Amino acid sequence: YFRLKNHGEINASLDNNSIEIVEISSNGAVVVKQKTDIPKEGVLKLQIHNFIMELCYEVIRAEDNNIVLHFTKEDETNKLFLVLKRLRDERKN
């Protein structure tokens, strides 16, 4: 697979509260820790250009101020994969 650095095409929120995403793959993401300690398990809302979805996630590693999320549902990671593959091709121009 592959990871993508966020160049601002990617916005995310948890329980309608926005979070900073800095890297993403079909199987997970690296996000920045905020004041509100985010749930160990939950639903992340992802927006990429005109595409919006929700992904079940869990926190699997906390590294300094970054949090590593794992997306737990295969069918949801399959959908995400295709969106990321589109976004990656767009950067290729």
Ligand SMILES: [Cl-]
């Ligand atoms: Cl909801």
